[PDB]
Paper text:
BT0996 protein acts in the initial stages of the RG-II depolymerisation, where its two catalytic modules remove the terminal monosaccharides from RG-II side chains A and B. BT0996 is modular and has three putative carbohydrate-binding modules (CBMs) for which the roles in the RG-II degradation are unknown. Here, we present the characterisation of the module at the C-terminal domain, which we designated BT0996-C. The high-resolution structure obtained by X-ray crystallography reveals that the protein displays a typical β-sandwich fold with structural similarity to CBMs assigned to families 6 and 35. In line with this, carbohydrate microarrays and microscale thermophoresis show the ability of BT0996-C to bind α1-4-linked polygalacturonic acid, and that electrostatic interactions are essential for the recognition of the anionic polysaccharide. The results support the hypothesis that BT0996-C may have evolved to potentiate the action of BT0996 catalytic modules on the complex structure of RG-II by binding to the polygalacturonic acid backbone sequence.
The crystal structure of BT0996-C with the N-terminal His-tag was determined at 1.65 Å resolution by molecular replacement using, as phasing model, the preliminary 2.3 Å resolution structure of the C-terminal His-tag construct, solved by Se-SAD. BT0996-C displays a distorted β-sandwich, composed of two β-sheets connected by loops. The structural calcium ion, highly conserved in many lectins and CBM families, is positioned near β-1, β-11 strands and H1 helix. This metal ion is coordinated by Glu21 Oε1, Glu23 Oε1 and Oε2, Asp137 Oδ1, the backbone carbonyls of Asp137, Thr40, and one water molecule, in an octahedral geometry confirmed by the Check My Metal server. Instead, in the 3D structure here reported, a 2-methyl-2,4-pentanediol (MPD) molecule present in the crystallisation solution could be modelled, establishing CH–π interactions to His36 and water-mediated hydrogen bonds to Gly133 O and Thr73 Oγ1 from β-sheets 3 and 4, near the loop region.
Residue numbers in the entry: 11 to 141
Write the structure that this text describes.
């Protein structure tokens, strides 16, 4: 039960990217497409104002034919892990879809990191994070 959305988009392709991936356009959107390997991650850096629980909405594709578990960490500016959760991204057709979670905890104004990683991210693509 989050607070009101802010109407802000943070593009995946200008987030902090690690591992093996490609930036590609698909159906007019630019996304980060992850490949094989154990060291892949995407980390958005967001700055929040008024204090609330935040909904986090990921625009993504999962072209693998199976649900894909991904570890989410919500991290504060000093490296404190405020939330750790497995998100399961359902398989999608070759079209961008949305997956929502929350910060779980009430967060005050500050700079935060939304980190997604998994042992396997092959076949996941991310367009953006909306808050
Ligand atoms: Ca994008
Ligand atoms: Cl966990
Ligand atoms: Cl689409």
């Amino acid at each position: 039960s989050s607070g009101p959305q802010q109407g802000l988009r943070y593009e995946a392709e200008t987030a902090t990217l690690k591992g093996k991936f490609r930036k590609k356009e698909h159906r007019k959107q630019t996304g980060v497409f992850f490949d094989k390997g154990k060291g892949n991650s995407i980390e958005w850096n967001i700055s929040t104002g008024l204090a609330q629980v935040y909904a986090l909405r990921f625009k993504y594709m999962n072209t693998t034919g199976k649900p894909m578990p991904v570890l989410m960490k919500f991290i504060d500016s000093k490296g404190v892990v405020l939330k750790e959760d497995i998100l399961t991204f359902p398989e999608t057709p070759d079209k961008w879809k949305m997956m929502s979670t929350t910060t779980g905890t009430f967060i005050n104004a500050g700079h935060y990191k939304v980190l997604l990683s998994a042992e396997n991210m092959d076949g996941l693509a991310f367009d953006a994070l909306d808050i």
